[PDB]
Write a protein that binds this ligand. Sequence first.
Ligand SMILES: Nc1ncnc2c1ncn2[C@@H]1O[C@H](COP(=O)(O)OP(=O)(O)OP(=O)(O)O)[C@@H](O)[C@H]1O
Ligand SMILES: [Mg+2]
Lengths: 288, 52, 52, 367, 73, 73, 116, 116
Amino acid sequence: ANLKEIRAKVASIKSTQKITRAMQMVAASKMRRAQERMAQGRPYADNMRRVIAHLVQANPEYKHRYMVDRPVKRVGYIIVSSDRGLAGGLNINLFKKVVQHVKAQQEQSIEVQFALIGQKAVSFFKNYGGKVLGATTQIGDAPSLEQLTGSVQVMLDAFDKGELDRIYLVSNGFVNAMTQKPKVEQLVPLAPAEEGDDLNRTYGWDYIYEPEAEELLNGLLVRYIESMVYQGVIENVACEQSARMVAMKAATDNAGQLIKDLQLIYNKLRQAAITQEISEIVGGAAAV
Amino acid sequence: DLADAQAQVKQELDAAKAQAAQLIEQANRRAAQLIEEARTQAAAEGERIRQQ
Amino acid sequence: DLADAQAQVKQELDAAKAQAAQLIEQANRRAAQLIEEARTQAAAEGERIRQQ
Amino acid sequence: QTGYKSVDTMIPVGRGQRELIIGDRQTGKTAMAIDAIIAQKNSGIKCVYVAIGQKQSTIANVVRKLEETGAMAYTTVVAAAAADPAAMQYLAPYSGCTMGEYFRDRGEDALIIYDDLSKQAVAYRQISLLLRRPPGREAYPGDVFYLHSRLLERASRVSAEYVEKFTNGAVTGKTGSLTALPIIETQAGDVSAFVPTNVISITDGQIFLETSLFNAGIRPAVNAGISVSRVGGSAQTKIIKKLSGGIRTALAQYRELAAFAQFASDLDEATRKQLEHGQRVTELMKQKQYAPYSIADQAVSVYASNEGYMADVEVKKIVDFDAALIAYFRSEYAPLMKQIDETGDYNKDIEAAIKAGIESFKATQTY
Amino acid sequence: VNAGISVSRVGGSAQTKIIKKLSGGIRTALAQYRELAAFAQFASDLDEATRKQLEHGQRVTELMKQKQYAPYS
Amino acid sequence: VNAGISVSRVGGSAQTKIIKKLSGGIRTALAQYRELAAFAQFASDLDEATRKQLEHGQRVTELMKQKQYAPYS
Amino acid sequence: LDPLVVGQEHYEIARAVQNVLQRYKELKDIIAILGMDELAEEDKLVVYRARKIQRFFSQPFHVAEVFTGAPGKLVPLKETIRGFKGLLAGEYDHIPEQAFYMVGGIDEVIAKAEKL
Amino acid sequence: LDPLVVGQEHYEIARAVQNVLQRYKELKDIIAILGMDELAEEDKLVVYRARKIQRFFSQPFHVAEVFTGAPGKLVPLKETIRGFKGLLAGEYDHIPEQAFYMVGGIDEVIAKAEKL
Ligand SMILES: Nc1ncnc2c1ncn2[C@@H]1O[C@H](COP(=O)(O)OP(=O)(O)OP(=O)(O)O)[C@@H](O)[C@H]1O
Ligand SMILES: [Mg+2]
C-alpha cells in the first residue's frame, strides 16, 4: 500500500517536530528580552507620578478634566493585540472579555467607540462593526512612542470635546512565565494613584513654575497617559511571546503522538504486505 | 442634496419591481409543472382503461 | 439650482415608473411563454405513452 | 458531448477515444455513463449499454429511466446479471462490442459503455482458476491484460477508405467510429491494484471520482487534479476550446495552495483573491442529474466566470445565479443560443452578444 | 556519507596514531551540528554560544566535501 | 477496565436488583467522558456543563480501583 | 434519497447535514496539531453544530432499555426534519451539546436544556 | 553531467542553475504567505532569475508550423552556455521576463526586448 509514502510522511512530521522546538527556543529568549525591557520604563512613570501628585496636592485650587469623574454617556476602548497568530488563545480571550464588557455597557444605554492596535484587533472589530476612530498596524516588538501617539491622541481629542467620558485600556497581564490574564482598566479618569503619599511626609517647599501651573499640569498629564499606554503595550508583547512558547511546546507534543500512532499503522501494513506476498508466491508455486 | 435623496428613494422602487417580477415568474412557472403532472396522470389512467 | 432640483427629481421618478412598466410587463409574458412551452411538452409526452 | 460542465471543459472526449471512468463505490459512475448516453439525443450516434454482474432490479431501473427520457429509441442493452453463469459475464462485453462495431463499419457513429469491467475480470478469474491454470498477482490469470486489450482496442475511428472497402462502395463519403467508456471500481482509492493498473495503461485517459468530494456536495465528484485526456484540445468545439483555459488555470491555482484554505485570515491579498476565485469556479462545476447542458449553456457559464462577472456574488448563491442566467438566455436570446449550438463558432459578434446579454442580466434580472 | 547512522565496529584500533588523536574534534563537531541543525534557518535570535557551534559545524560540514579520483594521504 | 469497549449483552438481568437499579448508564457516562476529555484537553473556555462532566468522570474513574485478592460484596 | 421521491425539503436537509459532517471531518486534523483558536469563526461554528448533530442522532430504542434503563422513543419523520432544519438554521446555538444526547424529538432537547 | 566529459564551464553553469531553481522552489510557501515585499534583498534576485530561467527553457518546435510559424531554432550549445552564464551573472537582469519566452538564442531575446 505504498509504504514509502508513509515513511516519507513520518520523516516529514519528525522534521516539523524539530522545527517547532527551535521556535520555542527563540520564543523563550524574546520573552526574556521583553520582560527585562518592561523594567526600564518604570523610573520615568514613577518620577512623573511623584511630580504630578506633588503639584496637584500643593495647588488644590482647580481640578483638571482628567482627574474629575463626570457623568458617563460614551466610553472608549484602546485594544492592543498581536499582528500574527500562532500564539495560544490570547487574542480570542481578550476579545471575549471586551465583548462581554461592551455588552454589559449596552444595558446602561451608553454606546462605545474603539481605537485598535494590531492586525488581529483591526480585523475582528472591522467585522464586528462598532464605531472605530483609528487603526494602527505593524507595531513590532520594540515600538517607538511615536507609533502610539496616534491612537491615544485621537482618544484624548475625542475626550476633550465631551464625546467621551471614560477610556478603557484593554491588554494582557504578565502573571508568570507561563500564564497570562486579560485586563480591562480605565486610564483617562485617572484613579488617584497613591495620592496619600507626600501628605504626612510633605515638606514646606514648592517648585518655581516657569509657566503657569495649569499649563504645566496639562503637559504632565498628557505625557503620563502616553507612557502608561506604551508600558501597557510592552507587557502585551511579553505575554504574546510566552503564549507562543506554550503553543509551540503543545504542537511538539501533539506531533510526537502522531508519530507513535503512524508507526503502529505502518508496522501492521508491513506485516500484512509480507503475508500477502508469501501467500501469492506459495499459491503460484503449488499451481505449477 | 435632498433631491439626491429622492433619487435614492426611487432606487427602492426598482428593487421592489424586480422582486415582484421574480415572484410572478416563480408562482406561475410552478403551474407549468402542475400541468405537466396532470397530463401525465391523465395519460396513465387512460392507459389502465385502454389496457383493460 | 434649487429650481433645477425638482425638475431632476421628477425626471428620475418618471423614468423609474417607466422601468416599472417595462420589466413587469416582460416578466408575466415570459411566464405565459413558459406555460405554453410546458403544455407543448406534455402534449408530446402523452402521445408517446399511448403509442408505447 | 457528455453534458457536464467539468468533463467537457477539462477532460474532453472525442469520437473514437477510449475514456475510463474510475472511482470508489457509490460515487456516481453509472450516473455519469447514463447521462452521457442521454445527452446524445440530437448528435445522432447510437449507444450500447452493457451490464455485467448487476442485480436485475438495477438493470430494470436503468432501462425504465432510459425509456422515460426517450433515450431508448437508439440504445441496446446487453444484460449479463449476477445469477448468470461465469461464461456469460465473461463473453458479454465482446458481444456488445460486435453490436457496436456493426455501425462503425458502415459510416455511422456508435458509443458503447462497459459497466464494471472489474466484474468481467472476476468472472474470468473464476473460469481460469477452475481450469487449473496458474495464477499470478491477486490470483488473477496471467493474461488478464490480453483479455482487456483485445476488447478495448476495437474501439477506434476508421478512415473513409476502410468503410468504402467494407461496404463495396455503398457508403463512400463518410467515416466510422466507436467510443468506449469502461467503468472500474477501486477499493479505498487503491489505484495500484492489478486490474485498475492494467486498464489505466490501455485507455486514453481517465475520470477520477472521489468519495470525499462527493459527500462535500461537489456532484459530480470529478477530481480535476488527476483526470487527463490524451486527445486533449482536438476533441473540443472551437468556442469551448477557446474558453476552457480560464477554468483550467483557475482550478490549477486554487489547487496549488489548497493546504492553506482554512487560513485565509493570515495571507496576503493576491493569494486571498486567488482563493476567492477558485472557490467560485469550484462551486460553478456542480450540476444536477439527468439534465445535461448543450454547448451554448456551458459557453455562456464559462464566459461569465472568466470575465469576473461572478466576482461580486457570494459563494453560497452561485448555483442559483448560473441557473437563472442560463434560463434568461434561453428565454431572451434563442437565436444566439441556436447559432452557438448549431455550429460552435466564436467571433467578435458572438462575444459581444454574450457580454451584452450578461450585462443586461446583471442589470435587470436580479436572480 | 550519512555520519549519523554510519558505524565501524573495529573503531579506534584501525587508525594511525595521528588521525586517531585528531578525529575527536571532527566527531564532536558533526554531532553538535547535527543536534541543532534546525536553527540554521532562523539565524536571527541565536545566542552567542549556539551561534559559535553552528559556525563551526557548517564549516566542518563544508570541509568534508571532496572530488573524484583525488585521494588524500 | 476500558469502559469504552466492554459490554455484557445479558445486561441488567444478570445482577441483583440493587446493583441493577443503582448502576445506570455509568458505563456510557465514562464512555462519553473519555471522548470529552480527549477532545477538551486544550479547551480554554470550559463552560459549566463540560466542567461538571469532566469533574464527574474523574470521580467515577478513580472510584473503581481495588487491590489483588480483595473481593468486595 | 432523491428529490423526486422524498421531496425537495427532505433532500436539501439531508445533503446539508452530510456537508456539515464532512467539513467537520476534514477540520478534525487541524484542531489536533494546532489549537481550536487558529480557525476562523465560521469553522468554529461548524464544529459546534457538527458535534450537536452527531449527538442528536442518538436515540433510546424500545429494545435497548435492558442495557441502559431509559424507555424507548419512536420519532416521526416530520419531527426529525423540523429539528434538523432548526439546528442548521442556528436557532439552537445557545443549547449546550449535552442536551442533544439520548433524546427523541426536538422538544425533549429544549426540556433537557432547561432542566440543566 | 560530469566536468571530465562536458568541460568545466558547462558543469558549473548547470550546477548554478540547479541551485537557483531548487532554492526558488523552496521559497514558494513563504512567497505565497507573506508576499514578495518582506523577503530579504537577497532571494529576490533569486526569484527573478529563477522565473527568467524557467521562461528561457521554452522552445518553439519546428515540426508544428502552426501557431508558432515554422520556427526551427536548433541553437548551438555554445549559445546556450553563453546565455545562461550571462543570465546567472546578471548582465540581463534588467530585461522583462516576458522577453525570455518562446525564443532561441540570446540575440533573439535581446531583439524581442528592444522591440517592446
Ligand atoms: N450531479 C448529481 N446530483 C445529485 N445527485 C447525484 C449527482 N450525481 C450522482 N448523484 C447521486 O449519486 C448517487 C449514488 O451514485 P450512483 O447512483 O451513480 O452509483 P455508482 O457510482 O454507479 O456506484 P455502484 O457501482 O456501487 O452502484 C445516485 O443515487 C445519484 O442520484
Ligand atoms: Mg454502478
